[PDB]
Amino acid sequence: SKGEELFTGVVPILVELDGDVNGHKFSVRGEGEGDATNGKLTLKFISTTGKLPVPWPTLVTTLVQSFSRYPDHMKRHDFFKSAMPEGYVQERTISFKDDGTYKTRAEVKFEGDTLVNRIELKGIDFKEDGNILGHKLEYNFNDHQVYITADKQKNGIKANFKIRHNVEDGSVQLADHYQQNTPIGDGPVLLPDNHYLFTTSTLSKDPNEKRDHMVLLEFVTAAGI
């Protein structure tokens, strides 16, 4: 496709998240860049509202699969780039086992030269001293592969996958993800055969940054079944 051409080199990224979890209002702003040729993303995220009311790792999947590296032989299966520049809506439900649920809706699209991911998140039925609102989760991330399938009736894709978060306990906190993506424009998009995205994420901190923040480096590739 022709949306593929927009990801040729290094593309600046802006992420904006407005969140509300059990009534805690918070906002995240992220800036960085993506290099889809090599499936590399680098971003620094800031909590602009003060200390984050949920653990950073629970937000990683919400905070741009258009930067996945699709091998040459799977280009026909890259829905995410094919929807650009007009973009796509990405919606999820994230169910934290024995705790609350995030519902998210995001628009991913070009604004000028910048790939923007603008997100709204609402969390309900969290335990005020559970693993999430009680900040019991380690600052790290366990990636898991994502099985992408076509949803031809919505002209888009869907996926469902589980993420495991480490608890400072040593226990594990499951986050069950359900995902739907739908194009924003009317043009044609690529509906893919079933395939996976594999991700390697690294969370770090900036020693000079005093705001609550997350530095994130990710490498992502597509792989056929």
Short mmCIF file of N, CA and C in Angstrom, two decimals, residues 24 39 46-47 81 93 103 116 132 138 147 161 173 178 194 204 215:
data_model
loop_
_atom_site.label_atom_id
_atom_site.label_comp_id
_atom_site.label_asym_id
_atom_site.label_seq_id
_atom_site.Cartn_x
_atom_site.Cartn_y
_atom_site.Cartn_z
N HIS A 24 -9.96 8.56 39.78
CA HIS A 24 -8.68 9.26 39.75
C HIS A 24 -8.45 9.80 38.34
N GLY A 39 11.40 -1.93 13.08
CA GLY A 39 10.48 -2.26 14.16
C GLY A 39 10.87 -1.70 15.50
N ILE A 46 5.34 11.01 30.26
CA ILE A 46 5.27 11.82 31.47
C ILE A 46 3.85 11.80 31.99
N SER A 47 3.70 11.63 33.31
CA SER A 47 2.42 11.90 33.96
C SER A 47 2.33 13.39 34.24
N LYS A 81 -0.44 0.07 8.76
CA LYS A 81 0.08 1.11 7.87
C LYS A 81 -0.90 1.43 6.74
N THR A 93 -10.78 -3.77 25.81
CA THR A 93 -11.12 -4.06 27.19
C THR A 93 -9.95 -4.82 27.80
N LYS A 103 -11.33 0.18 30.01
CA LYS A 103 -11.87 0.29 28.66
C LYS A 103 -11.18 1.46 27.98
N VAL A 116 0.18 10.33 15.67
CA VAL A 116 -0.43 10.64 16.97
C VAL A 116 -1.30 9.47 17.45
N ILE A 132 -3.34 -2.98 41.62
CA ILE A 132 -3.25 -1.84 40.72
C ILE A 132 -3.31 -0.54 41.52
N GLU A 138 5.67 -4.68 40.07
CA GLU A 138 7.06 -4.33 39.82
C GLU A 138 7.20 -3.47 38.57
N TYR A 147 -1.95 -12.36 18.50
CA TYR A 147 -2.49 -13.07 17.34
C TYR A 147 -3.52 -12.18 16.64
N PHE A 161 -5.40 -11.35 23.82
CA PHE A 161 -4.13 -11.84 24.36
C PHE A 161 -4.07 -11.52 25.85
N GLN A 173 -0.14 -11.01 38.23
CA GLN A 173 -1.43 -10.35 37.99
C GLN A 173 -1.74 -10.43 36.50
N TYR A 178 -8.81 -7.70 25.14
CA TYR A 178 -9.59 -7.86 23.93
C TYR A 178 -9.48 -6.59 23.11
N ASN A 194 -4.39 -14.47 9.34
CA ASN A 194 -4.00 -14.56 10.74
C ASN A 194 -2.48 -14.59 10.84
N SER A 204 12.68 1.80 31.52
CA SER A 204 13.77 2.41 32.26
C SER A 204 13.29 3.73 32.86
N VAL A 215 10.37 5.61 30.55
CA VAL A 215 11.12 5.55 29.30
C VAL A 215 10.92 4.15 28.73
#
